[PDB]
Design a binder for this molecule. Structure first.
Ligand SMILES: CNC(=O)CSc1nc2c(Br)c(Br)c(Br)c(Br)c2n1C
Length: 326
């Protein structure tokens, strides 16, 4: 398996672009940035609104929990490489506490509204609009040789007043090398691609498109998360029971993958269940023909069949968004 677009990006670029292990961090000044209030947390970091004391400009301060140097350099290198791209969070500085050596990444401030609260307020048009903005970011990172590998609403910061979107948390992100084979324990559970749940390791940018399709199905059908499985095996069952097992079996044999007796056992046998079955009164104002056609083109087992980010941006679904922009 190789990517159908942008397969040769890191091949033509000089080694220093993608050789993140050879980066030497140029640590800024811890004191320039003061923590103002906690705004979030996850498995690998704590996140604070901050102030730059030099210029009194707001910022985001990401304090990293203890992390291997290899892996923080990967996140730093990817951030530097994408800094300035459309809707990509901007890294501004990297600093460390002198005593304990605990690193903090400093970013542009985005006044986010949490998705659990934001997304049920979105009109059919805002959904179009914000999904388009997020597609610009994925196209750009893909065109630069990078897979984000952790697309989810928690990783998409939205200032809904400025109509502004940033893709954040590049901590699971990786450079793309044709036919290189990758760790499958990436993404977060509800957003993992079939490729991940079946041990297909030579995956690519297309993995972020599955994750975007999960996010999008969540939004138009008002069902967050869309595929709600308890552990990884349960995750593939939840998908199978929507896409049907027939399509899974053809996927499995194209890429020559055997599905582990117990997993095979768990998945069983299922009809495909039409996208229209998820329609109800709460969600009806969001589930038009064009939304479904687009969703159907993202949530395909076969990662090679999914639309690329550049294709998605052209689909008739976003025609009003393009026209406003042009
Ligand atoms: C692991 N999950 C979290 O930390 C969620 S809370 C949160 N993390 C943020 C990060 Br990182 C950046 Br960068 C920016 Br900009 C904003 Br705004 C963030 N907010 C609100």
């Amino acid at each position: 398996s190789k990517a159908r677009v942008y397969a040769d990006v890191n091949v033509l670029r000089p080694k220093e672009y993608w050789d993140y292990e050879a980066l030497t961090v140029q640590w800024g000044e811890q004191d320039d940035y003061e923590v103002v209030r906690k705004v979030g947390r996850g498995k690998y970091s704590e996140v604070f609104e901050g102030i730059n004391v030099n210029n009194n400009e707001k910022c985001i301060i990401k304090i990293l929990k203890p992390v291997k140097k290899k892996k923080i350099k990967r996140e730093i290198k990817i951030l530097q490489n994408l800094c300035g791209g459309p809707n990509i969070v901007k890294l501004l500085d990297i600093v460390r506490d002198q005593h304990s050596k605990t690193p903090s990444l400093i970013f542009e401030y985005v006044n986010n509204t949490d998705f659990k609260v934001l997304y049920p307020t979105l009109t059919d048009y805002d959904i179009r609009y914000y999904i388009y903005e997020l597609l610009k970011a994925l196209d750009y990172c893909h065109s630069q040789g990078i897979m984000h590998r952790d697309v989810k609403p928690h990783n998409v910061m939205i200032d809904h007043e400025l109509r502004k979107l940033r893709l954040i948390d590049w901590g699971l992100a990786e450079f793309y090398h044709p036919g290189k084979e990758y760790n499958v324990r990436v993404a977060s559970r509800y957003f993992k691609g079939p490729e991940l749940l079946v041990d297909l390791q030579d995956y690519d940018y297309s993995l972020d498109m599955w994750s975007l399709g999960c996010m999008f199905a969540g939004m138009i059908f008002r069902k967050e998360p869309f595929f709600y499985g308890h552990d990884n095996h349960d995750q593939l069952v939840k998908i199978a029971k929507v896409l049907g097992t027939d399509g899974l079996n053809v996927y499995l044999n194209k890429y020559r993958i055997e599905l582990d007796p117990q997993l095979e056992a768990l998945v069983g046998r299922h009809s495909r269940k039409p996208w229209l079955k998820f329609m109800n009164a709460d969600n009806q104002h969001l589930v038009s023909p064009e939304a479904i056609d687009f969703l159907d083109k993202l949530l395909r087992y076969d990662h090679q069949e999914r639309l690329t980010a550049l294709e998605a941006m052209t689909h008739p679904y976003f025609q009003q968004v393009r026209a406003a922009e042009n």
